[PDB]
Amino acid sequence: GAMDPSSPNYDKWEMERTDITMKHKLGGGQYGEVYEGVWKKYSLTVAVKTLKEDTMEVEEFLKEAAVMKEIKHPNLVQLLGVCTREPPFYIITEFMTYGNLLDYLRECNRQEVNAVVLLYMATQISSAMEYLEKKNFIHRDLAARNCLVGENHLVKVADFGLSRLMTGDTYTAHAGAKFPIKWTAPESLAYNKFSIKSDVWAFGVLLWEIATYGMSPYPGIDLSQVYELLEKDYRMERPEGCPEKVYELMRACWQWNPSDRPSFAEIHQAFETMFQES
Ligand SMILES: Cc1nc(Nc2ncc(C(=O)Nc3c(C)cccc3Cl)s2)cc(N2CCN(CCO)CC2)n1
């Protein structure tokens, strides 16, 4: 019985499929076939991600779970289990009540989610990233649409399908697939080179999304002209009401040369300080 500890095929992350109830579907977006559910064993609400026929290879789908088994942080969406073996595989995690950060910012009560709270959301995320950096992991998909919101303005980084444990300071992707131009660092766009610093650059973009309450980066700018603009030293302007110190932090994140970009440890301490000033 693989499900038994005595078994040689035992896996602590494998959970009894009949231990979960599939309620309302949450999909509608791009995360995939995401469902809301309940882990009866504890009547604990949970999020469930499913896999289909063609859609994606099983080795590709489980990649995200493999990554999530090695990271643990209050600001990183936590893995609760997986359902392999039979058809439709599942990936179960804690459930974030308010959905993705991007839509949250666009639908929120701006009087409640104010300057301090926005500041509190940036600090939490930089916290999760300081942990990933410290363990030499890269996320490669940092964006407001990939963060999740819980009660009390709790924010957690999600979507680890492209995350990787690095052996060095860099990771070179292959040449196939593409990457979100407006969130991707120059060296990643030009040479497909990723690193913690490329995550730092994306964090800067995420800050701008937060400061604008969900505006799309480089509004109105054609995607084919983004890179060359960035090469001519163009950078998004300071959002209305955005503190200059916070904006100066965005600019440091967008330094053309990776080594000129701050570390996530410096970024988090910088935000922790500003936030404590409350
Ligand atoms: C699509 C969606 N996700 C929600 N919560 C989530 N929590 C965790 C999720 C998840 O994807 N985990 C996960 C990860 C991160 C990686 C691998 C595998 C998995 Cl399974 S998704 C809530 C939600 N809504 C409730 C709030 N409504 C607005 C006001 O009530 C709108 C609808 N909608």
Q: Is 33 annotated as a binding residue?
A: yes
Mutating to test ligand 1, I would choose from 13, 22, 24, 31 the residue with most ligand atoms within 8 A of its C-beta, which is: 31
Residue extent(s) of CATH 3.30.200.20 domains in the chain: 8-95
| Catalytically active residues, by annotation | 141
| Nearest residue by C-alpha to atom 10 in ligand 1 | 47
What is the SS3 assignment for the chain? CCCCCCCCCCCCCECCHHHEEEEEECCCCCCCEEEEEEEHHHCEEEEEEECCCCCCCHHHHHHHHHHHCCCCCCCECCEEEEECCCCCCEEEEECCCCEEHHHHHHHCCCCCCCHHHHHHHHHHHHHHHHHHHHCCEECCCCCHHHEEEEHHHEEEECCCCCCEECCCCCEECCCCCCCCHHHCCHHHHHHCEECHHHHHHHHHHHHHHHHCCCCCCCCCCCHHHHHHHHHCCCCCCCCCCCCHHHHHHHHHHCCCCHHHCCCHHHHHHHHHHHHHCC
CATH number of the domain located at residue range(s) 8-95 in this protein: 3.30.200.20
Q: Which atom of ligand 1 is nearest to the CA of 32?
A: 11
- CATH number for 96-278 (one of 1.10.510.10, 3.40.140.10, 1.20.120.430, 1.10.10.10): it is 1.10.510.10
Q: How was this structure determined?
A: X-ray
* CA–CA separation, 187 and 205 (whole Å): 16
Token pair belonging to 217: 């980066």
Range(s) within the chain of domains with CATH label 1.10.510.10 = 96-278
Q: Ligand 1: residues whose CB is within 6 Å?
A: 26, 29, 31, 34, 47-49, 64, 77, 91, 93, 95-96, 98-99, 148, 158-159
Rounded to whole angstroms, the Cα distance separating 205 from 183 reads 6
- Which of ligand 1's atoms lies nearest the C-alpha of 77? 15
Pocket test for ligand 1, best of 93, 146, 157 (most atoms within 8 A of CB): 93
Q: Decide if 166 contacts 136 (C-beta within 8 A).
A: yes
28 labeled part of a ligand binding site: yes
Resolution of the solved structure (Å)? 2.4
Measure the CA–CA gap between 203 and 181, rounded to whole angstroms.
14
